[PDB]
Amino acid sequence: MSREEVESLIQEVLEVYPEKARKDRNKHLAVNDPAVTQSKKCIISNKKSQPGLMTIRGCAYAGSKGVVWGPIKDMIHISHGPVGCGQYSRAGRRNYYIGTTGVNAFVTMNFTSDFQEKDIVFGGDKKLAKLIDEVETLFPLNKGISVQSECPIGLIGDDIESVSKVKGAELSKTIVPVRCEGFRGVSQSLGHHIANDAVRDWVLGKRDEDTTFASTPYDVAIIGDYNIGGDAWSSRILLEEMGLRCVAQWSGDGSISEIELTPKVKLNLVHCYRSMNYISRHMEEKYGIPWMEYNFFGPTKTIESLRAIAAKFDESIQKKCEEVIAKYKPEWEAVVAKYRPRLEGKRVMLYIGGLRPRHVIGAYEDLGMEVVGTGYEFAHNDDYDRTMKEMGDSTLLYDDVTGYEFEEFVKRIKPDLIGSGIKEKFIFQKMGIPFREMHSWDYSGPYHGFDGFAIFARDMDMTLNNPCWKKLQAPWE
Amino acid sequence: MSREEVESLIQEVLEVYPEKARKDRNKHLAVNDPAVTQSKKCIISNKKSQPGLMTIRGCAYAGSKGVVWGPIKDMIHISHGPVGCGQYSRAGRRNYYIGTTGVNAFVTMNFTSDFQEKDIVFGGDKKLAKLIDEVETLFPLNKGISVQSECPIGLIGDDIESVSKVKGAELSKTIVPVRCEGFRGVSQSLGHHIANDAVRDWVLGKRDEDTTFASTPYDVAIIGDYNIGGDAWSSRILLEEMGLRCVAQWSGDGSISEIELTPKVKLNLVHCYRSMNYISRHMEEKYGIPWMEYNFFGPTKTIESLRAIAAKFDESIQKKCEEVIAKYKPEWEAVVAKYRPRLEGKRVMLYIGGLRPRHVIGAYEDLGMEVVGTGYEFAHNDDYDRTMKEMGDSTLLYDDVTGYEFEEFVKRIKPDLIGSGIKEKFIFQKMGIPFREMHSWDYSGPYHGFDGFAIFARDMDMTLNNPCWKKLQAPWE
Amino acid sequence: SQQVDKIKASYPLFLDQDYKDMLAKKRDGFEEKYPQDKIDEVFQWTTTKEYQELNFQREALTVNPAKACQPLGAVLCALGFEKTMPYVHGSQGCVAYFRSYFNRHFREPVSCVSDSMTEDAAVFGGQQNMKDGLQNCKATYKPDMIAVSTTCMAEVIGDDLNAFINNSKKEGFIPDEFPVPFAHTPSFVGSHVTGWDNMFEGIARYFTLKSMDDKVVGSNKKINIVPGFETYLGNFRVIKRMLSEMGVGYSLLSDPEEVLDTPADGQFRMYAGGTTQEEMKDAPNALNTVLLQPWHLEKTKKFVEGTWKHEVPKLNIPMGLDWTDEFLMKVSEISGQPIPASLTKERGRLVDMMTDSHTWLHGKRFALWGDPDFVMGLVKFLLELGCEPVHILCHNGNKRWKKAVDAILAASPYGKNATVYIGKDLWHLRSLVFTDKPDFMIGNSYGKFIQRDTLHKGKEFEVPLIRIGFPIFDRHHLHRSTTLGYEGAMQILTTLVNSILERLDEETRGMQATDYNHDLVR
Amino acid sequence: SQQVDKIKASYPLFLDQDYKDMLAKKRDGFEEKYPQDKIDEVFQWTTTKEYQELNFQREALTVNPAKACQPLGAVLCALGFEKTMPYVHGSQGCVAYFRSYFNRHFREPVSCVSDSMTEDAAVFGGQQNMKDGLQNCKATYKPDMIAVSTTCMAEVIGDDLNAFINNSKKEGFIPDEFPVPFAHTPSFVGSHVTGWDNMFEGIARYFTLKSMDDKVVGSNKKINIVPGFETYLGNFRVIKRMLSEMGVGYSLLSDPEEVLDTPADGQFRMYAGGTTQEEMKDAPNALNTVLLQPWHLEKTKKFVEGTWKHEVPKLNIPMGLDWTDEFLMKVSEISGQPIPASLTKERGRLVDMMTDSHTWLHGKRFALWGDPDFVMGLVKFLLELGCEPVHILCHNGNKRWKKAVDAILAASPYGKNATVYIGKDLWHLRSLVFTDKPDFMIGNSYGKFIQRDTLHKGKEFEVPLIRIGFPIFDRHHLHRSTTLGYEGAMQILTTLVNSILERLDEETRGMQATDYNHDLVR
Ligand code: ICS
Ligand code: CLF
Ligand code: CLF
Ligand SMILES: [Fe+3]
Ligand SMILES: [Fe+3]
């Protein structure tokens, strides 16, 4: 579809809006130029959603509690405030972990102060202290407490920092106050940044003066992988088969001790740049550890990223990388042989959060599958600069797409497949367009690594070519 | 209610019959007099059912395959003929056993020759031989084969005795042909007798010259207990706690080796006189073993029967019996204290097959719960002579009761509870009268012994006093 | 022993230590049991492919069949009619077994009488049995009609049903105008479904054969629906509801729905609802007759086409999406009524459920068994759902039905690994689910033992049973379910996807071992 | 690694030996995990009664709450109306979570907008957000009405919904005649059901309070039905069906049934069905208003009684037999219509199912939780079935409701061992089901983890979960079920008895150990 056709599409979708909404949303829609290396000249991002347009973005609490802090298994994360946020976010994200739930791991539990009217009017600080005492009494094997603020906490003047500090000194336990109230920022991304600052300020530096950890020149940390359906495990297996030592995981299946051990690694492998590039930059500054972005989506991307990571170490690591690539080549080659003919040359539109909009194009193209449109819920301009190169020519780019905008784009482009969240799945399934949840892998996965790519191809084939899509129109209509 | 009222009841119910049916069924209805010790002057039994009157009786195959031979676990029982009877009788009766089904025990499996048109036209003897060969190939751990004839087997002139003998000689295995075709006799009772003769003629006399079994003067054999829901086990526990050794069980949880060991016991404890009094009499004649009838339904009856059984042995057995009665007295006393007030003085009508019509009256009265009517599906006159002494004065007695007769009797008498089979349960539940299946214990039990009596009282309380019976009438009617 | 506060039934009472020791003493002293290692070895052997070969070489032995005899279906069909007493000419034990079988499946009274033929009749016939039984049944239970089938005894001795009933009427045992249809239902031919077919064809021939002169096709502007052997009341109900929604006048012939679901309101109703004699008399005046289960309604099909002159449409069982669509379109074309918006909406919601659940349903392998029309409808819906029916078994199916289902499987890429077996029993299927393990079984209650056997090999080899079909004895009130139409497809889809989900939940319930995949959201 | 023929998802992929070693090395090298014996001892301690006492001493900590916040119920209620856009004034993350929650439960699109208030609005207010959001929503999604609720942010900062909407209308952001009902739904008061109550009362006040002059009670000869927070589509459907059979004119107010079950027919409908504005305008002219869930419809009850002048009947939720009977009799006397033979037959059939299944149901002990009306209906039905509700939990229930349910338990001898807990969460219930073990749990999907924990203690301590309520995330299409009326009672009874039978089948599946009680017939 030609670039002029895409521009006409954008205008013929935008004309519905009132003038202010039209001019605002015009900056968030673009036709991709793979010859341009700047975003500010082509698209605008990280901006407030237009009111009443059914934005898909979440809040800072979702980006901090649900995303960064939540996966850390051996900590107890208190959703501080009314019952709703913790209840809706309880076990909504498949950040997988190993543990004994309620005993030594607490990822899928909903700890909350369950704010009532008296808590709103009088404050929840002493309630927070009593809650911490009850947490220690009833969950003595927890290795730290995080307090994720919901909107009333920031709006009523609650001093959770003082409570955290005092109860931590009294209990000799790490208590991390996270000011991730949902009104802060414009989306989950500021949640990423605030959670990163919380990790840096309350947890990261606790082993700075400790040298008891036996460090090796093959020490790496995984940064910004949340083990969605086991994604972090499928990446760590390849990292360690290359001879490297993965000291820490951030933060899927991650423990607090691993976070405290991260400053001792030799290389930070940042998967989700959007969520943990802040902590990676801080680690590079204060501790001197270099970090590099990496991509384990699909065979070509994981081979390139494995070779890049091995190039940062000595020759033994490079030889191990070549051995790993040789041993995994038949597996993904057989996956491609099985699934490429069924998906070859099929157009996809993607609307995911901050990293997976890009960073998964290669996985699609490794199956001979073109991406014609893509978009970000909460990305910044750096995300779009990295997006332009991966996107093909004359493709659609949407930032903070509205429900109507997504509807119209899919209506005209008519993609073979859509990848987005749960709030678009049933909408687009009702139109007869096969849908893949690219947040939760549709309760499947992992998708990272070679095993994850095999799963990715199988799921794409199962949903794209499902018989159910040849049935939506009744034969008598 | 007076005897004359019951007499007028009987006449009124009989009025709707044609004259021949009326005069036939008049002989099968009586008003009980416990003083009379004869039945031929009061009632007639063991007679053909009137055609078209919805008799509850079964066939000889049911009384032989389903009743006597079926429970024997390590044997393979072939329902010889069309698929129907074996399919309907497969696992219909809860004759419990211990074994590995399909490997060393085959009670709940349907082995059948699956007669087709060609089998009816040409015969099934060759099919039976090939089936036996396939049985040995596919179930090598079976310890014998029985062949239960269905109606066409005796109708088409099949010679299953010759096949059984020849394949037994060739395979060195006991193969028992049982001519239990459903048309023989009038009910299941002739099935009892034919199965008894099969046991006597093909199995019983195989260890006659075998003296290798170490016999003791405390040897008893349970005869006519089919372990319904574990009834035989609950009786055997009391038998062995009294110091006796139970060598065989007939035939619930019964192995064929137990049957072959029965002629070595000192006392035969015949529970169901109806089904195995024949084999008990033959054992007394040929082997000299005396038998006695016994009753383990309810605490009074089991105490009396335990004392009677211990009276047939030395003083150590009597002392053990007294100790058993002393240890079990608190259990049934507590059961009575819990359940008597909610069942005291409640009238029961019973219609069970041939031993449980009587022989459970004591269990009902031990909870202070009277029986006003009783009846037999297939009993003989000796059963009624044993019934009159136990039934109360001026009670109703019915032999081979018809569906209409039972309906009318329950309609006028209005019993508090009914005990009968599955073909009456829903009929009487729809009239709002609580129903207890007294064939299968309503998939509960056991009811034998003290543990069985506890279960009996619990079940009677749960069904009699259930809230559901105060709800059949809509409040607006 | 027993505690009055917590009384134990057989389980777990017999797990007590004293009972355990008693049973061990019984086993060691007198049972002469095979050693446990030999038992384990033999079981492991029965799980193998060589044992599967020996199993499938069976020619005379049937183990755990998946079918019943004809008079059972005849009794069900007869119960379909108004104030009709099923009357089986033969021995009483058969009637006792039919009544108990249907009592256990439906949990309702089943009224059926026998003439109680005995050894005396075996050489003299059941003629006097017929006269006395007919007279007694009419005088006692007052039916408006008596539908006569046969047990294998009467079939073997050669009892002339027509002559016996005629002589009963001549001698005055039964009025000459009292309707007594008859059908020979030999238990050694076919299965219960062909007994249903025979009974229905006999009743239709009784009520229509002699009065075809005044019959004009379509003159009553109705469509006849013959449901066949059906044990889901929801299927009768859904067919009637769908035809009522379309505004199509219909006559449901052999409708036992009312008599098998009578209210418990203080009285017992031996008769309730059912197809009236007038409806059967007027049936040849319908526009057309639709057979819901054509693969066991052959005789009815020939009678309806040849005598009523009805051009019976070639329709598959209305199961799944495509076949229900074909049923509705054919009904619309025959009756002239358009398909209403409600049925189109129902179709769309079924499709929505398919889209919602396809990921969990995709690729799941199934072993299944039952009656032919039900089995093929299940296979078609499974293929529509993206599932892979690996083992399809119909013990009473034939080669024509096998060719039809093979053609159905060949039209979808999800039938490539499928195999169809006819004439095989549940022991064959036990071998199949051991050697080529499916994810689940769909079948009747007899499958539970198979699930037992697989579990004995190990939890990782267990094949859970999904209870769809007849008979269902170990669950309550499943006979009220629906399997036909969009509603039945929705019920089947829900059952299947939630069975998959509960199996996955069980497999991922072990904490710190497999509970990483114990997702709240699925 | 992976094999292309059998690709493994996370389970059982991570059970591979290499993944096992990787995870063990991760745990030992860097996780600094507590020793397994310490973990086992702590868990065993959490199963004790001393831990139960400490757990029930909780005053500030809530673990695994069984409730949500008000705007969720407000969104559901708003979805009940025709072409109505739910519009939550506040922060967008709340709307994302509400939409995700309802998407997961219903497996359907959930349309809801936010004015996306941010830190700028935290001090200034949401006035500009209100104006722009109303204008954009109307211009983009073209609703016929916008129903406005609030997130806790707007409630805390004190946004005046009425003034904001009025000022938006005055300045042309939205037409003056465009219906914009509003309700304050604070997330820190009550629960989601309170939000449903508030939203419905706000809509009713918007459409009726100013037009009461020409209203005559009973002039339209109809009965108003307010269903409350309801997440079973079958409940709306069964209420409509029962009133239709009775011949009773009715108006279902806040009917989300159509929009939550839209067909997948190639197009997406953001709106479908729902209560029309004319219906709500004419509602004061009804004979009476019946509240299906009175215990969370207090505000609606006061508005209906005080303004519509309807004498709202004191009716329990129409669950079970007695309460459904009371509902039908009250409807009959209010409308003057007699109860039809079909509903009496349905009642008799439910009673027949009770008689059929009472033996397996009798004495069974239950722990259960959910919303107050649903929980109390479940308790009433359980007492009607002879079951023993041992643990009754309502996280959002109150002391009046507790007194009512205690009174109901005192009437039956099966409530003697019962205890009712209000304000308690699923961790309290975990302690309860450990220390005083029931046979089963009835509740939403969050109960699965409890079943996990019990299984960790041992198979003999496992308490299986029966999924009835909201939300149900780990099963598909259970939201289509019914719980009210005779039909809902039949569904609940079938679920309960078949759960009991499935558990017993599992317990007796071990060959040669417990399979002596693996009965074919139950
Ligand atoms: S064998 Fe007989 S009908 Fe004596 S055929 Fe029948 S398990 Fe009955 S009254 Mo079912 S003569 Fe046993 C009997 Fe009694 S099957 Fe059971 S309960 S004590
Ligand atoms: S009285 Fe008894 S149960 Fe009847 S047949 Fe005869 S042995 Fe058997 Fe069998 S296959 Fe069916 S059920 Fe019969 S018609 Fe024949
Ligand atoms: S934007 Fe985010 S999810 Fe929203 S509240 Fe704010 S932190 Fe939370 Fe919470 S209880 Fe309910 S869901 Fe809200 S209205 Fe408050
Ligand atoms: Fe859907
Ligand atoms: Fe019933």
Author numbering:
A (entry chain A), B (entry chain C): 4 to 480
C (entry chain D), D (entry chain B): 2 to 523
What does the primary publication say about this deposited structure?
Nitrogenase catalyzes the ATP-dependent reduction of dinitrogen to ammonia during the process of biological nitrogen fixation that is essential for sustaining life. The Fe-protein mediates ATP-dependent electron transfer (ET) through its [4Fe:4S] cluster to the intermediate [8Fe:7S] P-cluster in the MoFe-protein; the electrons are subsequently shuttled to a [7Fe:1Mo:9S:1C]-R-homocitrate metallocluster, the FeMo-cofactor, within the active site of the MoFe-protein. The active site FeMo-cofactor contains a [7Fe:1Mo:9S:1C] metallocluster coordinated with an R-homocitrate (HCA) molecule.
To compare relevant reference states, we pursued cryoEM structures of nitrogenase in solution by preparing an anaerobic workflow for the generation of single-particle cryoEM samples within a glove box. Indeed, the determination of intact MoFe-protein structures required either surfactants or the use of carbon-layered grids, due to the localization of MoFeAs-isolated to the air AWI, causing strong orientation bias, and disorder of its α-subunit.
